[PDB]
Design a protein around this ligand. Structure first.
Ligand code: HEC
Ligand code: HEC
Ligand code: HEC
Ligand code: HEC
Ligand code: HEC
Ligand code: HEC
Ligand code: HEC
Ligand code: HEC
Ligand code: HEC
Ligand code: HEC
Ligand code: HEC
Ligand code: HEC
Ligand code: HEC
Ligand code: HEC
Ligand SMILES: [Cl-]
Ligand SMILES: [Mg+2]
Lengths: 483, 484
């Protein structure tokens, strides 16, 4: 094997190894025979009678340190509970650390799921398993995930000659999509079915290669029966659909959108491209060099002590969206505004208006809460799209409003949105028609101010939901200026 | 040996009552699952017995045979099994939620059933005999399944023979329900000298028409030294049946006494202040001299009436159950002081030329029950009738009146909303009261009369604006404009 494991990298990359160690990636697998303290959950007294197994039966825990994610699975000792002798049983009871309680799949009591043939392509390095090309192959792996070489490729040649043998740094979403997806392998099992993890002739996905050569990811189109995505396209299945969701978002096409536009320059790339966003202090990135949109790596830091403990965000949840979704350089009377989302919600637009933050802004609600609704169990949707309460009702799905407002009905909450939006859509139609009609007076100061007031509300794109009273105040002031 | 004849005996003469009682969860509380296998709830198929550590064949009864408002179903195993005495039954260690649709397992009691008759069944069956320290010899037995007619009306043997000559008990007294809907110690004791958890004396169980205190010392805030049963606010903490101890601490329990202490008391008043008057059938008169009881359980809950709500047997819908009494309907006139305009304040219908201004929460479907009966003890609505302020929610780690509907807001945020509203309204009320006292000489004027009434709506409402903040402000603003 060419995989040397994480300990090899601590000497030369001391800080990165330390920061990686604190991440839940870095604590994903614990050997509980070597480290009994790491085995979570209560096995004391009668618990074994309920569980139908005991502490001594367990070899590993999956999710060794909880972060944002909290449910911990157990892998039993090799060969036990009905699995082949060269594989391990994933157990039928998981521990919810955050809730502090066992969760038992009753139908699988006694019958462990084979770990390596079902799961471990997303969990370990250098995995070999029997395929229909190699039915004979022995089941084995090199090292525990989620580790350096899974995101940077094998380290053997690099540890010998660091300057001469380069590792892969990928800002590509595929670097994360190799695990943060569902899909079928190109390879097949001895029985002719696909694996649930990336796998081809050559084995697992390797950073620097094309994911499609190893893995066909699930999609809204491929999910004929609506088992994985809701009709809104948000993830339904709790299990890891961030990448398939992300592919449907503007973030994925952020750089392409910039290229298609006539006014594109190098200034723009900071908000539209990962390479530019993640360029270190002196470096230049140019329209020709940039290839990628707003990928996972823009929002998530794989090993940085400044990142948040849960979900490794590069900035706090309050800033993670506003960093790009602002109009900071461009709120001036006479100029049209682009995406003033930060400013609209917090109510800081200048132009002589005092600060009028929305009620929800003052109550601590932020972009993430409405635009990343928990549509798949406890997981925040990466579609970035609001689930309207009507669709919450129509599909029996969680929505952007009802989790914070369980006292209100979905029809009540939808009526709030429609009342706000119909009012603001109307005023926007009037003021736009008045601005077009009086185009000849464009040079006047009154018109310039009305154009900008109108543009804040329009370009915001929420039709008032972000800050209803400010939207009204602005479009009222726009019409006063227009006579 | 027993005077208890069971419910079937009453069906012939009281056909409608028996039918209505049959649909109540009282009437379906115990099912024999050997005689009726369909009645056994929960999943025993496949591997479930390996998890549960028992099987369907081990079960004799189900407690809570029909779910209503209450949803968790318990199982009683076959006689003598799982570690209990040979003359008693094991209450099992796994309950079925049904509302959730899932098992709930007390892991510590796997293998060890709790003895049903000596621990529980005084609240569940008629004619219960168990060994006491007076009669250690007595054999454990019972007459009939609860929750049945004779538990609320007394034994039926003599009455079925001679209906007109041998009267049954109808009680509007809260004790009629408090005999089960409480926690406390029996006056009787076990062979070991401990009290039973159900009413029991020398003569056995509580009988309707007798005084509960002769059989049972109910728990109280004062008796609960260690705060295991009540929160510091006095609301129930323990999920298990504390409606009666809660009810005793409320004005509803003293509603008739309050009326008697007042000088202007008349027979008109009794409809809102007394059970006998409230429940008086078409024709009957109730007078200050006849009425003995306040606003008891029986005012709000109907024991067998097809017009009641299916869950909790409410006599009126949750939207009307409080407003029926908490209104000022006959008394909003300029110049007169208003009394308890709670309905009117919340819905914003006060007349006096003002258009309708219902509060935001009124328009959003919030009602008295939601704020005043917060679920402080698991899924059970508190009968203390008192709001739990979010500060006390935070300070004690208890559910509060606001956070369940507003989980997005912090408890400090929600308390600040209340204090902002209340401090504003308390201030305006202090100004307008001082101005009304000061200009007492101008009392005959139309302006003053209207300001007195506006002030009185907001003051007598007693919420200091929480019921409808904007209306409170509008009224006290209008009161001060009139006082210029
Ligand atoms: C350079 C000077 C720039 C050009 C040319 C463009 N941008 Fe941006 N951008 C940003 C956000 C958050 C959005 C989404 C806004 C929304 O959906 O409301 C955009 C969008 C665009 C678009 C249109 C795509 C669409 O309709 O959604 C174009 C053509 C475009 N951008 C070109 C963020 C930022 C940003 C953050 C600080 C900067 C500096 C720029 N964009 C700069 C440019
Ligand atoms: C497998 C080979 C993975 C790769 C490559 C990446 N991730 Fe991952 N991730 C993986 C697992 C099995 C888990 C669950 C264990 C856990 O840490 O909770 C995760 C978890 C995350 C999380 C959640 C972190 C938390 O606070 O709980 C995030 C935010 C995350 N992963 C992001 C992420 C990014 C941005 C990646 C590439 C740049 C990436 N992951 C790669 C498995 C694998
Ligand atoms: C910002 C523009 C983001 C991009 C691009 C991606 N993610 Fe993300 N992620 C983001 C936030 C703000 C959060 C927190 C959500 C919350 O309400 O807490 C997350 C969370 C995750 C998680 C944890 C899942 C959960 O607990 O809800 C994972 C595993 C994750 N993100 C992975 C991930 C991957 C693989 C991405 C590229 C496909 C990706 N994210 C993009 C913000 C952003
Ligand atoms: C820059 C580094 C960004 C961060 C951080 C976030 N967003 Fe973004 N977003 C950005 C661009 C350039 C675009 C336009 C992309 C395009 O090709 O048109 C977007 C777009 C969105 C949208 C529009 C809907 C869509 O196209 O999918 C939404 C709703 C959105 N962004 C939300 C959003 C949220 C909630 C964020 C924080 C977690 C966030 N974005 C971060 C640039 C950047
Ligand atoms: C709910 C309390 C929200 C908060 C907080 C924020 N947003 Fe929002 N947003 C919300 C709604 C209901 C809508 C309207 C969607 C519709 O289909 O009518 C929006 C709209 C946007 C958009 C434009 C949507 C689009 O054209 O695709 C964007 C880009 C957007 N929102 C981003 C955004 C950001 C960055 C936020 C915080 C700074 C933010 N929103 C807050 C609901 C809510
Ligand atoms: C928490 C994560 C929330 C989400 C998501 C949404 N709302 Fe909200 N909202 C929240 C708080 C804490 C508050 C303040 C206290 C309270 O609960 O009232 C609000 C406030 C509102 C209001 C009143 C606004 C006003 O102008 O007076 C409305 C009408 C409202 N919220 C509606 C609403 C809708 C329609 C949402 C999704 C589209 C939504 N909220 C999201 C907390 C949170
Ligand atoms: C308490 C849990 C009761 C059970 C069980 C049953 N009854 Fe009842 N009954 C009870 C009360 C408190 C009252 C008076 C107040 C009220 O809600 O009506 C009654 C009234 C009756 C009457 C009076 C005649 C009438 O107007 O309907 C009868 C004849 C009567 N109850 C009979 C009865 C029978 C036959 C029951 C079981 C088969 C039964 N009741 C159950 C309290 C409770
Ligand atoms: C006739 C064959 C009866 C049987 C059997 C039972 N009841 Fe009865 N009951 C009967 C009559 C004729 C009357 C009074 C006159 C009338 O208007 O019907 C009653 C009255 C009651 C009452 C009211 C209190 C009283 O006046 O005694 C109650 C609470 C009552 N009955 C209850 C009751 C119960 C619980 C029975 C069986 C367990 C039962 N009755 C049998 C006629 C007959
Ligand atoms: C025991 C001898 C009881 C007496 C007397 C009364 N109640 Fe009761 N009640 C009892 C039990 C064991 C249960 C639980 C089973 C069930 O019905 O859920 C109840 C339940 C209620 C309920 C809830 C009904 C529901 O929908 O779930 C109510 C509202 C109720 N009980 C009221 C009540 C009243 C008003 C009583 C006297 C007038 C009364 N009960 C007597 C046990 C016993
Ligand atoms: C009459 C048939 C009533 C019904 C139905 C309800 N209430 Fe009541 N309430 C009533 C009276 C006569 C009184 C005054 C009692 C006294 O002795 O002075 C009350 C009092 C209250 C109070 C005040 C606080 C207290 O003393 O406990 C509250 C908060 C209260 N009532 C609330 C309330 C609610 C929430 C109701 C429906 C669930 C309800 N009441 C019904 C008369 C009547
Ligand atoms: C319902 C339609 C009622 C009628 C008729 C009468 N009263 Fe009442 N009363 C009612 C309620 C709901 C309450 C409690 C509300 C509250 O303000 O807390 C009361 C309270 C009283 C009180 C106590 C005053 C107080 O502490 O606030 C008294 C002294 C009182 N009631 C007397 C009374 C008299 C004399 C009546 C007729 C002449 C009368 N009430 C009728 C409900 C109703
Ligand atoms: C009105 C003035 C009431 C009086 C007096 C009593 N109860 Fe009540 N109860 C009332 C309401 C409106 C409700 C529904 C609460 C909800 O939000 O769902 C109840 C409920 C109960 C229940 C069911 C418990 C639950 O589901 O939360 C029981 C068992 C019950 N009530 C019993 C009970 C007893 C024994 C009473 C007198 C001692 C009593 N209640 C008085 C309204 C009123
Ligand atoms: C919350 C959304 C509430 C609703 C709905 C209703 N009430 Fe209320 N009430 C509420 C508060 C926060 C307060 C103030 C309590 C304090 O200590 O400051 C009140 C007050 C009352 C009172 C006075 C109680 C007392 O002084 O002891 C009464 C009598 C009362 N409320 C009754 C009541 C009724 C009948 C309701 C519906 C018709 C109602 N309230 C709604 C909170 C809320
Ligand atoms: C549901 C059973 C609720 C309870 C109990 C309480 N509130 Fe509420 N509230 C609820 C809804 C559905 C709404 C409208 C939509 C929304 O969630 O905002 C509200 C509204 C409010 C508001 C804003 C109203 C305004 O004046 O503009 C506030 C400030 C508010 N609620 C506070 C509040 C407090 C302090 C509570 C207990 C003392 C409380 N609410 C109870 C739903 C429910
Ligand atoms: Cl109301
Ligand atoms: Mg609200």
């Amino acid at each position: 094997t060419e995989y040397v494991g994480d300990e090899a990298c601590k000497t030369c990359h001391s800080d990165v190894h330390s920061a990686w160690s604190e991440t839940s990636h870095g604590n994903f697998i614990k050997d509980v025979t070597k480290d009994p303290k790491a085995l979570p959950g209560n096995f004391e007294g009668n618990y074994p009678k309920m569980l139908n197994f005991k502490a001594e039966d367990i070899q590993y825990v999956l999710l060794g340190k909880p972060g944002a994610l909290k449910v911990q699975e157990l892998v039993g000792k090799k060969g036990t509970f009905g699995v082949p002798a060269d594989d391990y049983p994933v157990m039928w009871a998981s521990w919810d650390a955050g809730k502090g309680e066992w969760e038992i799949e009753v139908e699988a009591i006694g019958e462990g799921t084979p770990w390596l043939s079902t799961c471990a392509g997303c969990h370990v390095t250098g995995l070999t398993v029997p395929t229909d090309k190699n039915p004979k192959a022995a089941k084995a792996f090199a090292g525990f995930g989620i580790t350096c070489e899974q995101c940077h490729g094998p380290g053997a040649k690099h540890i010998k000659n660091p300057q001469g043998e380069k590792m892969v740094i990928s800002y590509d979403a595929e670097n994360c999509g190799q695990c943060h997806s569902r899909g079928d392998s190109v390879a097949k099992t001895p029985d002719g079915k696909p694996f649930g993890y990336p796998y081809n002739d050559e084995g697992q996905y390797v950073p620097g290669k094309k994911l499609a050569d190893y893995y066909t990811v699930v999609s809204v189109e491929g999910d004929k029966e609506g088992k994985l995505f809701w009709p809104t396209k948000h993830a339904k299945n709790s299990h890891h659909l961030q990448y398939p969701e992300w592919l449907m978002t503007g973030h994925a096409t952020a750089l392409e959108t910039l290229k298609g536009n006539g006014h594109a320059q190098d200034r723009c790339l900071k908000c539209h491209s990962a390479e530019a966003y993640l360029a270190k202090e002196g470096t230049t990135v140019t329209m020709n060099d940039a290839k990628l949109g707003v990928t996972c790596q823009v929002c998530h830091a794989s090993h940085d002590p400044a990142a948040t403990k849960e979900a490794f965000l590069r900035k706090p949840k309050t800033e993670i969206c506003t960093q790009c979704h602002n109009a900071e350089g461009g709120i001036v009377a006479g100029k049209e505004v682009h995406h003033p989302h930060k400013e609209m919600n917090e109510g800081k637009i200048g132009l002589g208006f005092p600060d009028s933050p929305s009620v929800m802004y003052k109550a601590g609600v932020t972009c993430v809460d409405c635009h990343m609704p928990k549509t798949a169990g406890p997981k925040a949707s990466h579609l970035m799209k609001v689930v309207m309460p009507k669709d919450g009702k129509a599909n029996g799905m969680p929505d952007s409003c009802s989790s914070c407002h369980p006292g209100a009905s979905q029809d009540y909450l939808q009526n709030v949105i429609d009342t706000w939006q119909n009012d603001i859509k109307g005023r926007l139609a009037k003021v736009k028609a008045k601005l077009d009609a009086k185009k000849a007076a464009a040079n006047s100061q009154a018109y310039k101010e009305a154009l900008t007031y109108y543009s804040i509300v329009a370009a915001d794109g929420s039709n008032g939901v972000h800050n209803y009273d400010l939207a009204v105040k602005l479009l009222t002031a726009a019409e006063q200026k227009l006579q």
